[PDB]
């Protein structure tokens, strides 16, 4: 830089700056950075003096050279030189770099021995939980005699958690539920991983909402087919697309979760499927023809018949919803007298009064028999609430 | 070849061809994944800035200037794969961007998606 300033001509300096001042900036910057330890080791040192000289001189180079293609405010060097009050944030960041390089190399294993999943109470969990635990050990150990503020450690620790989980999800594009159960096991091993728990719940909600989008879109497409076509309901979307996707992308993974969370998300899933995907969607219909009622009855029939989860058979909510749905698929193609008399038997104990009235109105047209049926059901449900 | 292709991805971002861009990204990623570790490091130290730029692509023509959930998960997976081999000093920002997407991802109506 001395030879730049005091050794070159104006045009010479100008050209040579134009050419290398970008490289000058980046290389000197990265050097100072990598060597931040020894330079900020002391408060006043001919190293820091000299490097501030170099920064001022490079700024004067940008100035005298009058270059625009590259700029060097030097403000960054000024700040890092003034970055004497932390002295640990740099060390903590180097520790972060070590730990992230460690976790990266962890995924860089060609033998994939970490992918070897071990059944622990019964959940198959890879070896990655242990390595992440060890890296957290090493990091909390690094913070032991670091004078870093306890407000930057939490941010950087959650950053580790987030980065690591993102790494794993990238490495768990298809076995995401295995990742979910491994991190649930980690949470059970360490509850202080709140970033981890929130993120894994968020990505689980993400995947379930994604398949929920898929299934509700596919259901709305099937209902579009039903409203458009009355002859061939085209069960193809149901039999070979919807039911297998549900079993082997939802039912089987959610069972693989194998816990209260697994059963609970199964139960929420079949809420969303029975009620939201179908019950709410069918109730949104304007009119249902006899052939359309038969098609919905068949659909509902092979759904309850194709979506039975014996794991949740003991769940009263599961039994109630599946019975409500099966009795839906029953009463869809039946006549009003059958509806009324099986309501007299009490089979509609799972159906809301208004939902039942809407069902009868959507199925049966404007007839005085329907009015008798609706008033009978209304006043039966009215005397059933005075006791 | 990867260099030409990432150039193409760059200029396609200049052209807003996120589709073709991501296709070439698939291509080059799989190319290097069966190329080798040295190639990972080389592409990383050479074009992580490119990958970051394009993992932070935003289309001005997006409905309500909102990123499509498909494009959300696309860039999400993109950043996820990138994070694995990108240089250390960047892990923060991408991750932030990741969370930047994730929070946004956790803030949409999925059944009736205005951006689908």
UniProtKB/Swiss-Prot annotation, chain A:
GO terms for biological process: endoplasmic reticulum to Golgi vesicle-mediated transport; ER-dependent peroxisome organization; mitotic spindle assembly checkpoint signaling; protein transport; retrograde vesicle-mediated transport, Golgi to endoplasmic reticulum. GO terms for cellular component: cytosol; Dsl1/NZR complex; endoplasmic reticulum; endoplasmic reticulum membrane; nucleus; RZZ complex. It is a peripheral membrane protein. Keywords: Endoplasmic reticulum, ER-Golgi transport, Membrane, Protein transport, Transport. Coiled coil: none annotated. It is found in: Endoplasmic reticulum membrane. Component of a peripheral membrane protein complex consisting of DSL1, SEC39/DSL3 and TIP20. Bound to a SNARE complex consisting of UFE1, USE1, SEC20 and SEC22 or YKT6 through direct interaction of TIP20 with SEC20. Binds the coatomer complex through direct interaction with RET2/COPD and RET1/COPA. Binds TIP20 and SEC39/DSL3. Present with 8970 molecules/cell in log phase SD medium. Required for protein transport between the Golgi and the endoplasmic reticulum. May tether coatomer-coated retrograde transport vesicles to the ER membrane through interaction with coatomer as well as the SNARE complex. May contribute to the stabilization of the SNARE complex. This is Protein transport protein DSL1. It comes from Saccharomyces cerevisiae (strain ATCC 204508 / S288c). The gene is DSL1. The chain holds residues 257 to 754 of 754 of the full protein.
From Swiss-Prot, chain B:
It comes from the Eukaryota. It is found in: Endoplasmic reticulum membrane. Required for protein transport between the Golgi and the endoplasmic reticulum. May contribute to tethering of coatomer-coated retrograde transport vesicles to the ER membrane through interaction with and stabilization of the SNARE complex. Belongs to the SEC39 family. Component of a peripheral membrane protein complex consisting of DSL1, SEC39/DSL3 and TIP20. Bound to a SNARE complex consisting of UFE1, USE1, SEC20 and SEC22 or YKT6 through direct interaction of TIP20 with SEC20. Interacts with TIP20 and DSL1. Cells with a reduced level of SEC39 show a defect in post-translational processing of PRC1/CPY. This is Protein transport protein SEC39. It comes from Saccharomyces cerevisiae (strain ATCC 204508 / S288c). The chain holds residues 569 to 684 of 709 of the full protein.
């Amino acid at each position: 830089c001395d030879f730049m300033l005091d050794g070159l001509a104006f045009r010479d300096r100008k050209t040579l700056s134009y050419e290398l001042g970008p490289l000058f900036n980046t290389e000197f910057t990265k050097f100072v950075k990598n060597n931040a330890s020894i330079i900020l080791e002391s408060l006043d040192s001919p190293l820091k003096n000299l490097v501030s000289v170099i920064n001022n001189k490079l700024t004067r180079l940008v100035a005298k050279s009058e270059v625009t293609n590259w700029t060097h405010s030097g403000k960054e060097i000024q700040d890092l030189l003034m970055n004497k009050q932390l002295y640990y944030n740099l060390l903590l960041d180097k520790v972060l770099e070590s730990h992230i390089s460690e976790i990266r190399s962890i995924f860089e294993d060609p033998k994939k021995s970490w992918q070897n999943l071990e059944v622990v109470e019964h959940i198959e969990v890879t070896q990655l939980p242990k390595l992440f635990l060890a890296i957290s050990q090493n990091f909390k150990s690094s913070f032991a005699d670091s004078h870093v503020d306890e407000q930057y450690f939490a941010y950087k620790y959650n950053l580790l958690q987030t980065s690591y989980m993102a790494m794993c999800t990238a490495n768990f594009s298809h076995n995401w539920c295995q990742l979910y159960v491994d991190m649930r096991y980690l949470i059970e091993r360490d509850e202080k991983l709140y970033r981890i728990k929130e993120l894994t719940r968020n990505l689980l909600e993400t995947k379930l909402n994604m398949k929920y989008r898929i299934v509700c879109q596919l259901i709305r497409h099937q209902l579009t087919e039903f409203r458009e076509n009355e002859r061939n309901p085209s069960w193809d979307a149901t039999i070979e697309k919807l039911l297998p996707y549900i079993l082997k992308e939802i039912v089987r993974p959610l069972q693989k979760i194998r816990g209260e969370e697994g059963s609970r998300y199964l139960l929420s899933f079949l809420n969303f499927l029975y009620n939201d995907c179908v019950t709410k969607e069918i109730l949104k219909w304007q009119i249902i023809s006899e052939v359309n009622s038969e098609n919905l009855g068949e659909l509902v029939s092979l759904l309850v018949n194709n979506t039975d989860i014996q794991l949740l058979a003991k769940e009263p909510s599961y039994k109630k919803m599946r019975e409500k749905f099966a009795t839906m698929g029953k009463f869809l193609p039946l006549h009003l007298k059958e509806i009324m008399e099986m309501f007299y038997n009490g089979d509609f104990y799972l159906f809301a009064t208004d939902e039942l009235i809407q069902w009868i109105e959507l199925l049966f047209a404007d007839t005085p028999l329907r009015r008798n049926a609706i008033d009978d059901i209304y006043e039966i449900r009215g005397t059933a609430l005075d006791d | 070849e990867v260099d030409l292709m990432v150039l193409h991805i760059d200029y396609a971002l200049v052209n807003l061809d996120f589709g073709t861009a991501y296709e070439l990204g698939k291509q080059v990623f799989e190319i290097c994944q069966e190329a080798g570790q040295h190639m990972m490091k080389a592409l990383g130290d050479e074009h992580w800035l490119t990958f970051y730029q394009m993992g932070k692509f935003v289309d001005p023509n997006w409905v309500d200037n909102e990123i499509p959930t498909e494009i959300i998960v696309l860039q999400m997976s993109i950043l996820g794969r990138l994070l694995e081999v990108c240089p250390l000093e960047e892990v923060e920002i991408v991750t932030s961007q990741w969370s930047t997407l994730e929070l946004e991802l956790s803030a949409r109506d999925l059944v009736k998606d205005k951006y689908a």
